[PDB]
């Protein structure tokens with residue numbers, strides 16, 4: 006297994022950005038990637054995933070900002086579809102683990118119905134530092150309200 010990934014359930018993991026040297030490595034373990042990094046900060050083309058048969062969702066979230074609730078719902082629904090196909094999914098951003106950690110917490114809320122408090126604790130247990138900003142926490146609160154309703 007690619008030990009940089011941490012799984013929040015049987016099928017969904019989050020990690021730092023794999024480098025071009027690691028692409029075959031994570032393609033062996035994952036069939037789908039959620040790429041949160043902005044186009045201009047990529048060090049290889051995302052066609053690298055396509056030539057390996059890996060499905061790509063490119064939904065960039067700028068450095069130190071939170072996704073909108075709509076953006077997050079779109080990401081979650083796509084992850085859901087891939088998991089239902091039997092695929093393992095890797096969420097990643099470049100640099101810290103604020104943005105990828107936010108999507109990982111949202112996935113636990115969305116798929117397992119965990120309240121935000123427990124989902125946050127879980128992901129932070131996996132990677133201390135996940136969910137870095139007040140804005141990221143606030144969109145997770147907005148998600149929780151959406152789901153409860």
Ligand code: VO4
Nearest residue numbers: 069101102103104
């Ligand atoms: O720029 V971050 O993914 O550490 O919020």
